[PDB]
Amino acid sequence: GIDHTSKQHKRSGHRTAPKSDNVYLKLLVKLYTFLARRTDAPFNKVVLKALFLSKINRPPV
Amino acid sequence: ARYGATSTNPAKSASARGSYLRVSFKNTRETAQAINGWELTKAQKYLEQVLDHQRAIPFRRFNSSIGRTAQGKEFGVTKARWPAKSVKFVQGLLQNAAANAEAKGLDATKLYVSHIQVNQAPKQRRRTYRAHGRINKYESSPSHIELVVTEKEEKVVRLTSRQRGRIAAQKRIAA
Amino acid sequence: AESHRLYVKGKHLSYQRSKRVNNPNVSLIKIEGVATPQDAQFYLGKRIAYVYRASKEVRGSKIRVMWGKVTRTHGNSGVVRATFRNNLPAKTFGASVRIFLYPSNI
Amino acid sequence: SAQKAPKWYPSEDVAALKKTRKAARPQKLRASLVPGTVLILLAGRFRGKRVVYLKHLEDNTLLISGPFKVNGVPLRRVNARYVIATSTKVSVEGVNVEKFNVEYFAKEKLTKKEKKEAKEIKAERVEDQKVVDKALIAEIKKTPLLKQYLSASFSLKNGDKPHMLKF
Amino acid sequence: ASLPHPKIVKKHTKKFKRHHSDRYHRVAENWRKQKGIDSVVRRRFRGNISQPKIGYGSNKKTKFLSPSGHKTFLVANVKDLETLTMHTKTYAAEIAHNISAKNRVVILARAKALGIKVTNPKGRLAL
Amino acid sequence: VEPVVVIDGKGHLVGRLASVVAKQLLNGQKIVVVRAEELNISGEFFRNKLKYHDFLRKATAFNKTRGPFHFRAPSRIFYKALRGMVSHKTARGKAALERLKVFEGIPPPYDKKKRVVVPQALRVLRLKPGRKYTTLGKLSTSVGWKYEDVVAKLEAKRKVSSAEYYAKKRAFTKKVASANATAAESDVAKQLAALGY
RNA sequence: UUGGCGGAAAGGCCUUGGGUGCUUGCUGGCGAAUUGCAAUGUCAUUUUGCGUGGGGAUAAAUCAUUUGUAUACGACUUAGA
RNA sequence: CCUGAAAAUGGAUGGCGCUCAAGCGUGUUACCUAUACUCUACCGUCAGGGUUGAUAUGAUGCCCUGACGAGUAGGCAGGCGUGGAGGUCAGUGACGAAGCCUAGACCGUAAGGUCGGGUCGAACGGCCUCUAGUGCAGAUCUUGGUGGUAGUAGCAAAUAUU
RNA sequence: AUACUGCCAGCUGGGACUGAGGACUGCGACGUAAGUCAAGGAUGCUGGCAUAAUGGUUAUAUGCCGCCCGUCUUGAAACAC
RNA sequence: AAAUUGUUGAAAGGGAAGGGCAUUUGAUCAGACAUGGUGUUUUGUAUU
């Protein structure tokens, strides 16, 4: 019995993998999960997160 | 004919079957259970005494709210009856079994009722009439009496090393 | 001699229990002539065997044994807890257990 | 196909055992055990037999021989935990026990084929027992009544408590 | 035999029989969590049956293992059995219940020749 | 250590003896109680008479036959007191009472065998002097026991029989102690003396 | 085996004398072993079921019939070679 | 402490009981034991991470570290099972498919799955997906059947039969 | 001096439970060093058995616990349905 | 098929029976390792 300051087993609230089944998309994420883990440049980290986004979260540019 | 659970051999046995017999099933079961395991001659004489009220069939399972009698003291129970219909259906089958045994060539002196069994046959619907114009079922309980009569009739020792050493020890020490 | 007792006897008093909950894993053994827990400290680790007469021969012998060992003292009355390979049948409450002197400390 | 397939097949190889930092340091005995003491066997064939402790073998066992001419316990090894040491001791500066070791007690090279499904003391054992017992008996005669004491068996009588007994 | 594995313990062996499955014949034996407002099983009272939990989950290194240490793999024909030829140590073959007696003998003959352990060698033998 | 131990009831308390007895029964020791009518109860005699009459007041209203059997014999009032100190409703409790036998006087074969007291439950040792104690024999007498006199007229027979036993036993103890004294002051006896015996 | 005593649940106790086995009260002499380092390492005490070989004795009850001091039925109470 | 102190089934410090207490007051230690706390193992969830230059089944994978785990209404996730559809296993099957029974075995926490034995006679499965008239203990549920009650109540108006 | 309180990177003895991981890395100690090690988790030796022996299923017994489920309800074993 | 019933067999039963933790007892059940195995002269060289 512990005083739970915060909720337990709560998920981070962020996508970890693309909910989409697109096999070619998962190839890009597979590459960039490698790049983000094996480069300290925040560019790979931010682009990896932006690939997980949904259709409305990726608005056309 | 797929008889009941028999512990005998078909060679030294004779059988009689009766199906859809319009007899009180509950009264028949008690009649069958009474003679169960008796030699045929004494059982046949038993039933004759039952008609003439010299002896009473002990009612052991289906016995609720039936009156007491002195003739049940033979069987150790205070509840016994003389069901005439159930008996005459049984001795008719005993005579059939005896004839079957004679036909198969079995000794008359050693013949005993090894297995006797009663089962509830399909029950014939009728129509009683109760108060306030209500109809209720008024139905029989026929019996599938079956019985078979038969003639009468008349490991590795492991040890441990300690144990085997012990069994050798006591042999050699007390000679 | 007339006495071949290489062991010391004990009584299987009861399971380790609360007021209304028992634990069959831990048995309580009361030793003869033992009163203080300090005195019972000599019996820690000793092997306990419960010996009972079986129905049929099991291993070329009519007897059977359930082995155990004293694990800790229990209270101030010299009752010692015992852990058995297979727990006591719970019918032997107040029965006799044999408590040998090995593993000998002295 | 009755069962479709396992996609991930476990590897058949055996993983090498991690290096073990568990050496075999020599075993110490209880301070009450001195070569030449009179032990009290507690377990096995010879329960309750007083014996004489002779040599601490490398097998972490005890080479005891309560003189065979007295109690019948042969030259045999026992376990240091199933024996009770006693304050009494006997002089053993006249018995040779150097040749005693593990393979002198090597029972029999048993293989899975030489197994008897149904169910002769070595001359070397007896003669080597004699030359030892000659030294044990010769020394034991100086102290009185100990030969009788060693001959007799030990038992826990009624009403005496081993927790408060001194051996 | 099988490749080395830790001593397998089920962590629970008695089957989780449904509440009152003995009491009422209509209540099947298979487990159904009692979801009543007053259910003592749901409320986890002392002295009542244990409901299945995730704590009872077997060791992941010893899951789907028969006590012999082999994972049950259910084979029906020769070619499916040819799949395990290099995995004798980990998988054991079980011939399906609908494989004919004349067809088991070729499987059993092939399995013993390939070292595959079969856990029902006596199934549907004629003698 | 005895396979069965015979407890004398003279000078004991019903409660304190019962609890000691009840524990020893469950532990497995077999106990037979003798001279239960010589039991004592702390509290003046009339106080306990009310305490029993209040107990005798409890009868199953609709059928007094099946109610609490208010036994009056000293053996059974003590037996009642020991029940409730043991879970007699279960098999373990039933086996415990089976190992218990409570008697009036000292019936054979327990007459010719060593009686035992519980020092821990004695009236002398546990009651502050001056406190009124109630004899169980006098209590049972009032509450309905009809054999208080006959067990008395027979205990007198047994006591003189046991008294003659101790007459010849004390004569033997003189004989054996005289032999021990004569066989003392000897080289063997002196060596045992310095030995520890 | 002389006797006794013991009726509370006696079923036990005591004694005379004799034979018998052992005797560690003292001194000897011979055997122990392989149960292989422990595995209670089995020795008790109830109840019968088959048989050995002696002893001892050689019926009742119930049903059925009947009687009514009894009685719903049982039961009870009678009588009947 | 006593009187004050009287309620109706028999009766309640829980009971037995307890009198230098086993009561009241107080203090000392010793001791007992919760699913509490500590440590370890395992399950699961979450979190933070490691893991691709001929090197690993090619990553919802594997692994490491850590913290937690109650739960109705309710929410979400991963799964099991049923009727049928597309594909596949050139799947199984009259030498026996389905079904049914099995205080016989095994797997899974479980939904369930598998195997053995018996009856049985003609179709039926595993996996990837699709679809739904898809999972029952209750609804004074529907239909069918069967029980205890129970060989019981009762088969006694109309004078009566031998 | 001793009591009490406290400290020891003081020693030592006994007892219980646990052996998770599976090449190597690392921290470190002792070693002049070579190396060994109680240093990022148990090894060594011995014995018995090799099957109902351990274990499982089931039935029973015992110790303790266990109210009859669904639902309405603040509240269900309810003399609520 | 189940309810339900009979027979046989097994088991238990002092105002319930049934269930859980644990073990006894009885009944019943799978596993070892007895591995092609540190090889061992083929009776005109694949049994170690």
JSON list of C-alpha atoms (C1' of nucleotides) in Angstrom, two decimals, chain E residues 10-11 15-16 18 24 26-27 30-32 34 42 44 52-60 62-67 74 77 79-80 95-104 120 122-124, chain H residues 35 41-45 57 62-63 69-73 89-99 102 105-118 121 124-125 135-138:
[
{"chain": "E", "resi": 10, "resn": "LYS", "atom": "CA", "xyz": [2.69, -24.39, -12.41]},
{"chain": "E", "resi": 11, "resn": "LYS", "atom": "CA", "xyz": [2.23, -21.87, -9.55]},
{"chain": "E", "resi": 15, "resn": "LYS", "atom": "CA", "xyz": [-8.42, -26.11, -12.20]},
{"chain": "E", "resi": 16, "resn": "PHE", "atom": "CA", "xyz": [-10.51, -22.97, -11.75]},
{"chain": "E", "resi": 18, "resn": "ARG", "atom": "CA", "xyz": [-16.80, -22.27, -11.97]},
{"chain": "E", "resi": 24, "resn": "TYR", "atom": "CA", "xyz": [-26.26, -26.89, -10.17]},
{"chain": "E", "resi": 26, "resn": "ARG", "atom": "CA", "xyz": [-26.87, -26.57, -15.57]},
{"chain": "E", "resi": 27, "resn": "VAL", "atom": "CA", "xyz": [-23.86, -24.46, -14.56]},
{"chain": "E", "resi": 30, "resn": "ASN", "atom": "CA", "xyz": [-15.78, -24.04, -17.49]},
{"chain": "E", "resi": 31, "resn": "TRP", "atom": "CA", "xyz": [-14.78, -20.94, -15.59]},
{"chain": "E", "resi": 32, "resn": "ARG", "atom": "CA", "xyz": [-16.98, -17.84, -15.72]},
{"chain": "E", "resi": 34, "resn": "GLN", "atom": "CA", "xyz": [-19.10, -14.28, -11.14]},
{"chain": "E", "resi": 42, "resn": "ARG", "atom": "CA", "xyz": [-16.15, -11.62, -6.93]},
{"chain": "E", "resi": 44, "resn": "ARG", "atom": "CA", "xyz": [-12.78, -12.43, -2.83]},
{"chain": "E", "resi": 52, "resn": "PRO", "atom": "CA", "xyz": [-7.89, -16.78, -11.96]},
{"chain": "E", "resi": 53, "resn": "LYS", "atom": "CA", "xyz": [-5.48, -13.85, -12.01]},
{"chain": "E", "resi": 54, "resn": "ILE", "atom": "CA", "xyz": [-2.49, -12.78, -14.05]},
{"chain": "E", "resi": 55, "resn": "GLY", "atom": "CA", "xyz": [-0.21, -13.64, -11.13]},
{"chain": "E", "resi": 56, "resn": "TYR", "atom": "CA", "xyz": [-0.81, -17.32, -11.85]},
{"chain": "E", "resi": 57, "resn": "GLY", "atom": "CA", "xyz": [0.89, -16.94, -15.23]},
{"chain": "E", "resi": 58, "resn": "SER", "atom": "CA", "xyz": [3.53, -19.61, -15.73]},
{"chain": "E", "resi": 59, "resn": "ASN", "atom": "CA", "xyz": [7.21, -18.84, -16.15]},
{"chain": "E", "resi": 60, "resn": "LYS", "atom": "CA", "xyz": [7.81, -17.47, -19.64]},
{"chain": "E", "resi": 62, "resn": "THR", "atom": "CA", "xyz": [8.69, -22.73, -19.23]},
{"chain": "E", "resi": 63, "resn": "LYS", "atom": "CA", "xyz": [5.42, -21.94, -21.00]},
{"chain": "E", "resi": 64, "resn": "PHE", "atom": "CA", "xyz": [3.64, -24.45, -23.24]},
{"chain": "E", "resi": 65, "resn": "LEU", "atom": "CA", "xyz": [6.04, -27.14, -21.99]},
{"chain": "E", "resi": 66, "resn": "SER", "atom": "CA", "xyz": [5.00, -30.68, -21.18]},
{"chain": "E", "resi": 67, "resn": "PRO", "atom": "CA", "xyz": [6.74, -31.99, -18.04]},
{"chain": "E", "resi": 74, "resn": "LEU", "atom": "CA", "xyz": [0.33, -31.40, -33.36]},
{"chain": "E", "resi": 77, "resn": "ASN", "atom": "CA", "xyz": [1.07, -35.99, -42.04]},
{"chain": "E", "resi": 79, "resn": "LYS", "atom": "CA", "xyz": [5.58, -33.39, -44.46]},
{"chain": "E", "resi": 80, "resn": "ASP", "atom": "CA", "xyz": [4.46, -31.46, -41.39]},
{"chain": "E", "resi": 95, "resn": "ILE", "atom": "CA", "xyz": [-0.50, -37.16, -34.18]},
{"chain": "E", "resi": 96, "resn": "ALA", "atom": "CA", "xyz": [-3.98, -35.75, -34.67]},
{"chain": "E", "resi": 97, "resn": "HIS", "atom": "CA", "xyz": [-6.98, -37.66, -33.39]},
{"chain": "E", "resi": 98, "resn": "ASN", "atom": "CA", "xyz": [-8.38, -37.97, -36.92]},
{"chain": "E", "resi": 99, "resn": "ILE", "atom": "CA", "xyz": [-5.31, -39.62, -38.45]},
{"chain": "E", "resi": 100, "resn": "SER", "atom": "CA", "xyz": [-6.14, -43.15, -39.53]},
{"chain": "E", "resi": 101, "resn": "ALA", "atom": "CA", "xyz": [-4.50, -46.14, -37.88]},
{"chain": "E", "resi": 102, "resn": "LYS", "atom": "CA", "xyz": [-2.87, -47.18, -41.16]},
{"chain": "E", "resi": 103, "resn": "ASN", "atom": "CA", "xyz": [-1.52, -43.63, -41.48]},
{"chain": "E", "resi": 104, "resn": "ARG", "atom": "CA", "xyz": [-0.11, -43.38, -37.95]},
{"chain": "E", "resi": 120, "resn": "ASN", "atom": "CA", "xyz": [1.10, -40.69, -28.03]},
{"chain": "E", "resi": 122, "resn": "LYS", "atom": "CA", "xyz": [0.07, -46.02, -28.55]},
{"chain": "E", "resi": 123, "resn": "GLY", "atom": "CA", "xyz": [-2.75, -44.06, -30.18]},
{"chain": "E", "resi": 124, "resn": "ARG", "atom": "CA", "xyz": [-5.04, -46.14, -32.40]},
{"chain": "H", "resi": 35, "resn": "U", "atom": "C1'", "xyz": [-3.26, -10.23, 1.53]},
{"chain": "H", "resi": 41, "resn": "A", "atom": "C1'", "xyz": [11.75, -15.71, -7.50]},
{"chain": "H", "resi": 42, "resn": "C", "atom": "C1'", "xyz": [7.77, -15.57, -11.18]},
{"chain": "H", "resi": 43, "resn": "C", "atom": "C1'", "xyz": [3.28, -13.22, -14.02]},
{"chain": "H", "resi": 44, "resn": "G", "atom": "C1'", "xyz": [1.46, -8.83, -16.19]},
{"chain": "H", "resi": 45, "resn": "U", "atom": "C1'", "xyz": [1.17, -3.44, -17.18]},
{"chain": "H", "resi": 57, "resn": "U", "atom": "C1'", "xyz": [15.19, -15.38, -39.03]},
{"chain": "H", "resi": 62, "resn": "C", "atom": "C1'", "xyz": [14.82, -9.96, -28.52]},
{"chain": "H", "resi": 63, "resn": "C", "atom": "C1'", "xyz": [16.93, -7.89, -24.24]},
{"chain": "H", "resi": 69, "resn": "G", "atom": "C1'", "xyz": [-0.60, -4.40, -9.48]},
{"chain": "H", "resi": 70, "resn": "A", "atom": "C1'", "xyz": [-7.70, -3.59, -4.82]},
{"chain": "H", "resi": 71, "resn": "G", "atom": "C1'", "xyz": [-12.06, -2.61, -7.36]},
{"chain": "H", "resi": 72, "resn": "U", "atom": "C1'", "xyz": [-18.84, -2.10, -8.56]},
{"chain": "H", "resi": 73, "resn": "A", "atom": "C1'", "xyz": [-21.25, 1.20, -12.52]},
{"chain": "H", "resi": 89, "resn": "C", "atom": "C1'", "xyz": [-2.03, -26.83, -45.78]},
{"chain": "H", "resi": 90, "resn": "A", "atom": "C1'", "xyz": [-1.57, -30.84, -53.53]},
{"chain": "H", "resi": 91, "resn": "G", "atom": "C1'", "xyz": [-4.74, -30.92, -44.72]},
{"chain": "H", "resi": 92, "resn": "U", "atom": "C1'", "xyz": [-7.81, -35.31, -42.10]},
{"chain": "H", "resi": 93, "resn": "G", "atom": "C1'", "xyz": [-11.44, -39.28, -43.21]},
{"chain": "H", "resi": 94, "resn": "A", "atom": "C1'", "xyz": [-15.36, -45.76, -44.08]},
{"chain": "H", "resi": 95, "resn": "C", "atom": "C1'", "xyz": [-8.30, -49.15, -41.89]},
{"chain": "H", "resi": 96, "resn": "G", "atom": "C1'", "xyz": [-13.72, -44.68, -39.42]},
{"chain": "H", "resi": 97, "resn": "A", "atom": "C1'", "xyz": [-15.13, -37.48, -40.16]},
{"chain": "H", "resi": 98, "resn": "A", "atom": "C1'", "xyz": [-18.53, -35.17, -37.07]},
{"chain": "H", "resi": 99, "resn": "G", "atom": "C1'", "xyz": [-21.00, -36.08, -32.63]},
{"chain": "H", "resi": 102, "resn": "U", "atom": "C1'", "xyz": [-14.86, -40.31, -19.87]},
{"chain": "H", "resi": 105, "resn": "A", "atom": "C1'", "xyz": [-3.54, -37.44, -19.70]},
{"chain": "H", "resi": 106, "resn": "C", "atom": "C1'", "xyz": [-1.39, -32.74, -21.26]},
{"chain": "H", "resi": 107, "resn": "C", "atom": "C1'", "xyz": [-1.28, -27.22, -22.59]},
{"chain": "H", "resi": 108, "resn": "G", "atom": "C1'", "xyz": [-3.07, -22.31, -21.41]},
{"chain": "H", "resi": 109, "resn": "U", "atom": "C1'", "xyz": [-3.90, -17.54, -15.64]},
{"chain": "H", "resi": 110, "resn": "A", "atom": "C1'", "xyz": [-8.61, -18.17, -18.26]},
{"chain": "H", "resi": 111, "resn": "A", "atom": "C1'", "xyz": [-12.11, -18.03, -22.26]},
{"chain": "H", "resi": 112, "resn": "G", "atom": "C1'", "xyz": [-10.84, -22.90, -24.17]},
{"chain": "H", "resi": 113, "resn": "G", "atom": "C1'", "xyz": [-7.39, -26.27, -27.06]},
{"chain": "H", "resi": 114, "resn": "U", "atom": "C1'", "xyz": [-5.19, -31.08, -27.67]},
{"chain": "H", "resi": 115, "resn": "C", "atom": "C1'", "xyz": [-4.49, -36.44, -26.91]},
{"chain": "H", "resi": 116, "resn": "G", "atom": "C1'", "xyz": [-5.87, -41.49, -25.13]},
{"chain": "H", "resi": 117, "resn": "G", "atom": "C1'", "xyz": [-10.28, -45.12, -24.29]},
{"chain": "H", "resi": 118, "resn": "G", "atom": "C1'", "xyz": [-15.54, -46.57, -25.56]},
{"chain": "H", "resi": 121, "resn": "G", "atom": "C1'", "xyz": [-21.33, -43.92, -38.98]},
{"chain": "H", "resi": 124, "resn": "C", "atom": "C1'", "xyz": [-14.68, -32.21, -41.02]},
{"chain": "H", "resi": 125, "resn": "G", "atom": "C1'", "xyz": [-10.43, -29.24, -39.57]},
{"chain": "H", "resi": 135, "resn": "G", "atom": "C1'", "xyz": [-21.25, -17.51, -26.38]},
{"chain": "H", "resi": 136, "resn": "C", "atom": "C1'", "xyz": [-26.83, -17.97, -21.19]},
{"chain": "H", "resi": 137, "resn": "A", "atom": "C1'", "xyz": [-28.11, -19.81, -14.91]},
{"chain": "H", "resi": 138, "resn": "G", "atom": "C1'", "xyz": [-31.68, -16.65, -14.04]}
]
